[model samples]
Target chain A: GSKFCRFGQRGQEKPGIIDADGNIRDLSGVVPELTIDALAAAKGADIALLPLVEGEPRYGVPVKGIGKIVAIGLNYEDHAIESNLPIPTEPMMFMKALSSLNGPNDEVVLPKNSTHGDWEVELGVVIGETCRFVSEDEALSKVAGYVLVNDVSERFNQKQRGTQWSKGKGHDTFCPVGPWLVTPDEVGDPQDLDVHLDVNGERMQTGNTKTMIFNVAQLISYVSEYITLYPGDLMITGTPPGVGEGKKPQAIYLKAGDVMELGIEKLGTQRQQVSEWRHLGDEVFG
Target chain B: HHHHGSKFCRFGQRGQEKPGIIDADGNIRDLSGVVPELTIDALAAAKGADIALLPLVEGEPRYGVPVKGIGKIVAIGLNYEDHAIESNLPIPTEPMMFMKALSSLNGPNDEVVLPKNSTHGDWEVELGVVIGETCRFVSEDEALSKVAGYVLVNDVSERFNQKQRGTQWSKGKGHDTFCPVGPWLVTPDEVGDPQDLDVHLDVNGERMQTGNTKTMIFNVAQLISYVSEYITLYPGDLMITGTPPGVGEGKKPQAIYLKAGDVMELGIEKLGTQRQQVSEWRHLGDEVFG
Candidate 1:
């Protein structure tokens, strides 16, 4: 005899199913369910009857599909202010070739010719439904979920090599996203979260979403008005202040072997090791 | 015919002129004399010849290698300086190099689509380069050796998605039919001093972007060097040294997207001309109109 477990729209618990018969149970509450045999039996039935395992399997990329990973730039005022850049009247957009995307905890690959690798902690929003010509209000409702995002950059190529940011941002592993996606309802006001990034344990970027110049709804809406927002597409709300480029004296860039950690308030944290681009002929990762 | 390395002179299938070939002593010969207007046969016949000559046309043909692969399509942000001040952008610290995908390529004199999501399709005429061989870690002089030739180009772009939504110029730059290149691949020796070339694009006979190659911040050789340091460039690849000022939509009062029935013409001094009509994007399942 099995029962089903109920989940609220927004709760801090993992979802689960009860049993064949009606019996309320917590995944953490049932002893028999904890064992492998019971779990197997539960899985054999039509429904999934599992409890929240102690962070066993992490939440990874939420979007089920992806064609290209595009990025927006200089969309935040506080970020511009911190870097001593003028407030951009228009949104500065750039592409970080889709190759830059990685799952939670994936290591960042430092570009071989780079000396100014930096980190930008942002809120990653996933588009679940295919949307085109969507209105502002419709844009908010289409978001599938939210995750922590890190927009790693190579400032030297970004600023020095001509004008476009793609030169610096498109390195193989510049953008890291995931852990687990919190459904939109679970995320509450995306503008209310606190985000931070630390390099070698020193707090570097610290800011709240409230300070965003273009809120999530606005950005998603604004972006979709032009670029068709496809299912599984990712839109990283701009990062907050304190990028390495804004540091005093000579700015620093990420090099091979640098450990960086970044996270949003409750979603989760991700750590990455910077490494070199591995050519196909080499026995390494690109 | 005497053979020299992998070079060959080819003829055209019809009335098209055969690409001229060079002899073992470096003497140039008109391919039209050898093959009766058929370029393909001339290529086959000259396979053992002393030089390689690739036949090219100046207008839209049913099939051709996509453009943008010929050059980096390195775009300049606000080269007009006045446009810079008008847009309130700082005078550029360096030339802007954005890679438009080779996927957006279309034939010269072809009809281009206004991307489904774009409301601001714009146009720019630019000087283009056609690299001949593999090159990496080369000095400036050696860099020049890799260049195969030049061509006239039109970089059609979507301004709003590029500027308003977010980062990634590719958004506007990647839509199908965004880049139009051709009119002919003029060998460097045939057109010396790339800097002294004139280029312009006229929409329906109304001039839009009028500029010269001399204003280029990073010339062909320098760009080949810079781009190679990042991504590898192959033969037959294209690189557009950013367009000169006067791009449509970047003008005062805001000139906008191109519509159907608008005839556009652009060309570099010796590269010949390219003309095309604007069209709309058709879905995958939709019946294509002739």
Candidate 2:
């Protein structure tokens, strides 16, 4: 029914409600858990929105207490064509390690020796309830909201390092999700939305949800048939064409100091700075 | 060096895990006050010999997965030559890694629910390696030091979903209750040589798979090192070495798939045994749904 977000510093992130003027109102008092799952369970009851700070707070992933991040591959026609793979007869599924999840604006560390670090901007569906074997007729009803996701990948580890895509997709900081979670009521028709991504001010991807091969409802219904989708489980709908790997004159992978800005229609925008991996053993472990 | 005189296990009803230590005589000792939970964090801080001398609990407690806070279950495919021969897969020059969904994790004696419309539910008994330290790009020589201990795991599979679905094996492998890890986590010293262990599985008291870990193509250290090069192995992460041959799909005349009401028991050399019943999926309506 409204916008919800998790924002604060790295170790002290807290959930809040975003107001019309783009400021955070503390929801910690009303919702003890302060996670998207908590917001989903609240079902938009009228509550007082008290201002937490003067300006915009740094946004973490809008949802916390996430159980898993399931992803679909080749769900976009143009993307499948660009990747040189035949369209899937069914949802091609894979998982990103939970450790890979980082805040929307968090610095993305390119994995060591990665030759094909890439970017994918996709629509992310946040499940509100536990779903199993739900029909497409009832699939969308299970979704609590939607968020923007950057399905960061390393193509070499994904395709060349073995048959499994998880090897390449599961590096730390590979999944950057959020900005804020826009409730379905605010999103209106989930199928018709503008999705765009730009790197360093150059538009790399421009697409619409209308172009998705398997729409949100079909994806939820298909994926839930095998794996049970739990509360706070994020199922990222596949990305459209124009990933770094899909570039024409040889693939253009991400490098240090790259900047990516992506947005979905009502889900807001995310800006990330790409950085090389840094070992923090002495500072962190000590 | 610290001496571990007992094996460790986490037990209680589902979702309420408690930590306990198993003595030489196989009695359970309560370690609830000493450790927060039988988790990787707790194991990393405590000395096993000190835990072995704790006061005993009154009676046996239902067992859960031997460790808690497992970040992920990294599985190997066709790591045994006999299994490779049976599966008709070429022996890989490097490790073939796939993942089992975290929701698939269940207790040792929990029921394995057959996914609806599934016909090829099968079982693979393998040695489960428990990682106690964070490791990335670690050499084979340093791989074994990161291991906390060993446990038993049943890598249940729906074969049709694996092959017919696509090249991705995780789709068929990620059904709820597909992985059952078990009764005890025997420390490395107690387990001695990782390669010299007996792994066996039985369906309804009839022996189905009987093999020795010594026959494995890629030993534990090499697999740990290879997989860490790609993904970080964290505390409580499980690495299931590939199973020995004798899967139903590999049977000669007709493939034998698990049916409802079947019982399975599997174990490793030093690790304890686990027994589970097979059941069909149902809408239990136990959780919140929109």
Q: Pick the candidate with the highest TM-score.
A: 2
Instruction: State the RMSD for candidate 1.
Output: 11.8
Compose the digit string of candidate 1's lDDT tens values, residues A94-161.
55545456656767766666678899998887776655546777778877667788888888888677
Provide the lowest-lDDT 10-residue window in model 1 chain B.
B2-11
lDDT of candidate 1 vs native?
A: 0.61
In every candidate, how many clashes are there? Answer: 40, 0
- Considering every candidate listed, which one attains the maximal DockQ? 2
Per-residue lDDT tens digits of candidate 2, residues A150-176? 999999999996889988887777788
What TM-score would chain A of each candidate receive against the reference chain A?
A: 0.77, 0.93
Candidate 2: stretches off by over 4 Å: A40-49, A54-57, A81-85, A277-286, B44-53, B287-290
Locate the minimum summed-lDDT window of 10 residues in model 2 chain B.
B281-290
